[PDB]
Ligand binder design. Structure first.
Ligand SMILES: CC(C)[C@H](NC(=O)N(C)Cc1ccccn1)C(=O)N[C@@H](Cc1ccccc1)[C@H](O)[C@H](O)[C@H](Cc1ccccc1)NC(=O)[C@@H](NC(=O)N(C)Cc1ccccn1)C(C)C
Lengths: 99, 99
């Protein structure tokens, strides 16, 4: 699709067999989701942004589907205000910025 | 122009007749710039991000030029690591997300 930015660019993703909403975020390097249980082993990590650092669980090679497009990559889970899709998966689905 | 997302989407902006670099960010509602001393009146404000909140000063009606395109609006100034161009100015330059 072509998404304009008059509203937050929130879409539906599918992950773990669950449906969620997430923000398409060109200003994020990584993908951060709210607390959930995913199958798999995970490692503790830290990530930062405005306000500071949070602790997250890192899951690799996770299948996610973003507007019907498949991506397979690293997902961090932790206490984010919002589900964020970052550049690690935006590139996999062929996302660009245009103006 | 079309910007790919392999790297962070950093572009040149002109503000106050000075050039800076800034991140095009579809996940920011607001525009946040590094500390600098603009003339003008300001309001104090708090904005949040992944790790919590920071204090900023709010300036309205600022002209920024982004890759040749002008935009005019509210800019928040404070102790950010990176200059962030948010949706309030992105919409004005006709910027879209495409995949
Ligand atoms: C999500 C996280 C993994 C990401 N971090 C990240 O990419 N890092 C640390 C790598 C890095 C280092 C140096 C330079 C560039 N990038 C991040 O926070 N990115 C920030 C940019 C940044 C980078 C480093 C330090 C400081 C800032 C980027 O601005 C994101 O788009 C971020 C995403 C987000 C959105 C909502 C709530 C939490 C996080 N937006 C924001 O932090 C903005 N907030 C915002 O727009 N809010 C709170 C309103 C809102 C609410 C709900 C939904 C959308 N918007 C502020 C910049 C204004």
């Amino acid at each position: 699709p072509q998404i304009t930015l008059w509203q937050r660019p929130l879409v539906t993703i599918k992950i773990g067999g669950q449906l969620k909403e997430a923000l398409l975020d060109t200003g994020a390097d990584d993908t951060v989701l709210e607390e959930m249980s995913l199958p798999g082993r995970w490692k503790p990590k830290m990530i930062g942004g405005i306000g500071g650092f949070i602790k997250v669980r890192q899951y690799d090679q996770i299948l996610i589907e973003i507007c019907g497009h498949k991506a397979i990559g690293t997902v961090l889970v932790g206490p984010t205000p919002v589900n964020i899709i970052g550049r690690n998966l935006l590139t996999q689905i062929g996302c660009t910025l245009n103006f």
